[PDB]
Amino acid sequence: FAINKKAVEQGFNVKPRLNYNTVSGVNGPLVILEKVKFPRYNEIVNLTLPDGTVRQGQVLEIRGDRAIVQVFEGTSGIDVKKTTVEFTGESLRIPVSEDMLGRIFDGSGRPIDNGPKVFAEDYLDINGSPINPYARIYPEEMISTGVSAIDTMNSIARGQKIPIFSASGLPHNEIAAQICRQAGLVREENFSIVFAAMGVNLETARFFKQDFEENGSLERTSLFLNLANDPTIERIITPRLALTTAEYLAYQTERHVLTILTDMSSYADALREVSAAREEVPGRRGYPGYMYTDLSTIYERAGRVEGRNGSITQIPILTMPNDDITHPIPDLTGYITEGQIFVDRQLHNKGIYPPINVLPSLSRLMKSAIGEGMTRKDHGDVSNQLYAKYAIGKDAAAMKAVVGEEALSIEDKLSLEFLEKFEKTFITQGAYEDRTVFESLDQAWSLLRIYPKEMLNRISPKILDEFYDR
């Protein structure tokens, strides 16, 4: 109890900071100082324009009495005679407290809800340290979402980094809204949700706010809003702040935290912007040849620790800017993040909400997540048979489109019928409709029963004998 006193005893310690006026060169988002008396690497500074406005920035590289500062919030109106730059001797920090729940912060982590300052219990370096893998708990405890497709073919365990691959003009926002509306486990504690909004438009923000107010979950959540009308440079910081806050909450309060990272595309764009001016070697498509490491740093910050009940699950939102999967961003993400959720376009074109195509999607952790005691043992082989039948229906329809029904065998017609029934009754569900995993299994068995006992080959004899009938 008193250990907090021991930690914070250093607080009553005041150290001054030098005021430099030595602007020696500036080119866009870079400023150069001189004779700066042993500057620390990657620390923070504050700028006072002659008008009387305060900006912020950090040092990026240092040589003998020459430091390059990076200014997040613009660079216009920079003189050489009325510039006040003062160091801080530290990397940027954040006022952290459990109190922030129910608060709304800008992209710079400042209240924008007409509220006062929050009396933080501590401060943290925005960037974190890697966790020893020796103290990592492998995921378990499958998570319900009220959505047939995910809960039936791509089940999710507590603690997981899985992206959503969508394209422009898709309801991904609404999908996430439903997911947070239908959180929880089938086997409780209401989830604590962190939302990181970077480079978005007003309508999306207002939609999310109204959704949270409607569900009432707002009171156990907080937001970081960064729009398209704000400096790009600072845009890369918001995910770091959100992740640090999630770390604090989960691993110092033992809370189950759900994080919704939005528009990784914009984050990658900002990375490329900053790298281009820095003149780094372009790895591919202009993106620097090391952004993979940054993505790893962002994504590998999730899991379960040995002695911490609290858990953090990351669901970043990714938009491929070609309606393509070969784009570098999703490729690296797939190399990084276990599990993945794809989003269909034809189903949306066919007005089938939620438009999802299971086949490209994959969950690399659903194996252990499912099992006996949480679901009937058939669930897995049922899903496998569903995959087989679905793929057979797809390619059978494709080949029929060339030859037609005349060259089709009966099993082809069965595949087409199963495909149509599946895609028009099973996957589809209303905006406020949820299904238990067992109900989903019932639907899957009912649809499968169209075929006879023999065609089902991905199922062991006993499972067929036990579940082929009602």
Binding site: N4, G11, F12, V14, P16, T22, K117, E121, E213
Partner: protein, 173 residues
């Protein structure tokens, strides 16, 4: 369909109302805490103003302030800007600091000090000093009020810990 829509609307109205109420309550609580902190800061400013008015206390404290500023600057020359009514003690301790700068360091003592012929607004600061490089390009502010402002945020976690005791919800620190 109209009934279902209206029922959803009623749910929205109730949720909006309750969320607004919760926000108002939390804002009021936090504002009250802020008011308490502001009162504490007012008392601290009053204390600083009172202490600045005793030359006996002001002399050694001022000397230590200037010594710290110089030991930060590490320069063979320096300039000092302060209030006109404080120049007396500065002139008193000029030589003392002249030797102390080197004493704390291991190089030769300082060379010279210039008292700038221009002074801060009285209302701006109750007391303190502002030290500047001989070139008047690098300067350090040790004004007591600035000291208070700087401390009012760095030490805030300990302040809140004292005011509200244990966190009661942190199980690893």
């Amino acid at each position: 369909g109209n009934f279902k829509s209206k029922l959803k609307k009623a749910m929205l109205s109730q949720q909006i109302t309750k969320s607004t109420i919760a926000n108002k309550m939390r804002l009021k609580v936090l504002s009250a805490r802020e008011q308490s902190l502001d009162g504490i800061f007012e008392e601290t400013k009053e204390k600083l103003s009172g202490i600045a008015n005793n030359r006996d206390e002001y002399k050694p404290i001022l000397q230590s302030l200037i010594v710290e500023a110089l030991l930060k600057l590490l320069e063979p020359k320096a300039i000092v800007k302060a209030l006109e009514r404080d120049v007396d003690l500065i002139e008193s301790m000029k030589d003392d600091i002249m030797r102390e700068y080197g004493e704390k360091a291991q190089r030769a003592p300082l060379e010279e000090i210039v008292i700038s012929n221009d002074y801060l607004n009285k209302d701006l600061v109750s007391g303190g000093v502002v030290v500047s490089n001989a070139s008047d390009k690098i300067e350090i502010n040790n004004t007591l009020e600035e000291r208070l402002k700087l401390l009012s945020e760095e030490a805030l976690p300990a302040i809140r810990l004292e005011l509200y005791g244990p966190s009661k919800t942190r199980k690893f620190f």
